[PDB]
């Protein structure tokens with residue numbers, strides 16, 4: 001082709017297995033927002049591609065000891081993949097080692113509760129101890145709390161980093177399941193995009209509360225020096241300006257929403 | 261050691277004259293969100309700078325016949341400024357001729373009405389002729405309507421492009437004044453950021469209605485090949501992650517809002 005290796009992550013509704021995925025081959029085993037975005041970008045830039053789910057299941061963080069990058073970021077840094085098409089947050093530490101397109105989606109950190117939990121804000125979580133709260137490992141939300149100098153978020157970090165049993169989860173699905181099973185005694189910090197999707201799905205027992213804690217974006221990532229950098233950036237901007245990104249968000253979040 | 265020329269535009273609350281500006285020299289004549297942002301970026305990247313208000317008062321568009329770029333985009337393209345620090349929208353046609361940082365603000369096109377105007381959406385505007393509407397000349401909003409292939413926006417463009425008297429204004433302030441004087445018979449299409457600011461200012465007679473028409477961002481722009489490109493991008497990401505951009509938006513929009 002060449003057949004370009006695209007790293008991504010299993011995260012609803014971005015990349016999901018189709019019903020009866022075991023009868024399909026290759027790229028056709030998957031569906032979701034990023035599966036459609038990959039198809040659109042590949043058409044615009046004129047590449048053949050193969051979806052490769054990140055082996056360790058992580059977004060990407062650098063180890064304090066070894067300074068080795070894991071997740072999708074690592075797949076790009078170490079030359080295993082040529083492009084990451086996923087809900088991968090544009091951050092300073094990642095921009096130092098990979099390139100990102102302009103954002104294809106705008107978002108912020110948010111709070112997920114089980115319906116009826118007496119929490120409306122981050123300040124509400126920080127000033128109490130009955131309701132535990134946590135976030136995803138190896139991603140931008142955990143780094144946000146680790147680095148914040150805003151007093152409320154500092155207090156939240158000081159609690160989460162030492163909480164027993166652990167409040168951190170290896171996947172978003174694990175955090176959502178923990179909210180649903182914990183009878184109102186666990187809240188989960190996650191991006192507004194994920195939170196809004198889950199709120200639209202049965203059993204319709206969770207909701208997003210309060211405003212977003214920050215304002216940022218997801219971008220399509222390429223390794224430094226890639227000839228795909230500019231074609232990818234221009235493709236994302238063309239798709240944005242043609243309304244395709246809005247159409248795809250509606251397709252995967254709202255058009256078949258299940259919770260009224 | 262050089263004093264870097266920064267192009268910007270008079271647009272509230274991004275760049276405004278201080279009270280009694282005439283008794284100040286150079287950069288000290290101005291205040292606003294972008295004045296503060298310029299100071300922050302200059303400190304991070306270690307440059308001296310001089311604010312130069314764009315002589316033609318335009319954001320930037322390309323002439324179809326002469327192929328010449330005007331506005332702030334032109335100042336960068338033709339080597340008259342080294343940075344643009346302004347509410348300059350990241351678009352495909354601009355990305356082809358200049359570079360942009362990752363976004364420092366997220367926004368979309370929105371509708372401004374005189375309070376009481378029976379309009380809640382773009383669809384409402386397009387299906388009637390009793391209320392006129394327009395937008396700024398030489399910017400991204402006008403280009404949005406010109407280029408749209410979505411039915412409602414096509415209808416709106418077809419009306420606006422032939423309307424007489426002209427519904428395109430030279431400045432945002434002109435458009436706002438036209439809304440305020442027209443007894444509900446003129447509405448204005450402008451970015452949500454500028455709409456939200458005006459709604460917080462006396463005489464508190466305008467408001468934003470409906471959702472935004474699109475989702476995009478403002479970036480700090482540099483000419484292609486600039487040694488400032490990476491320093492600027494990293495500074496914006498640092499200011500974002502540190503919460504400084506949020507503090508600046510609150511300072512200039514909400515902290516002293518006048519309309520409840």
Ligand SMILES: N[C@@H](CCC(=O)O)C(=O)O
Nearest residue numbers: 059087088089139140141
């Ligand atoms: N989008 C995040 C993952 C989710 C999260 O950290 O909440 C990242 O790129 O790391």
Ligand SMILES: N[C@@H](CCC(=O)O)C(=O)O
Nearest residue numbers: 319347348349399400401
């Ligand atoms: N931010 C716009 C100007 C305002 C508008 O077009 O509404 C631009 O960069 O062109």
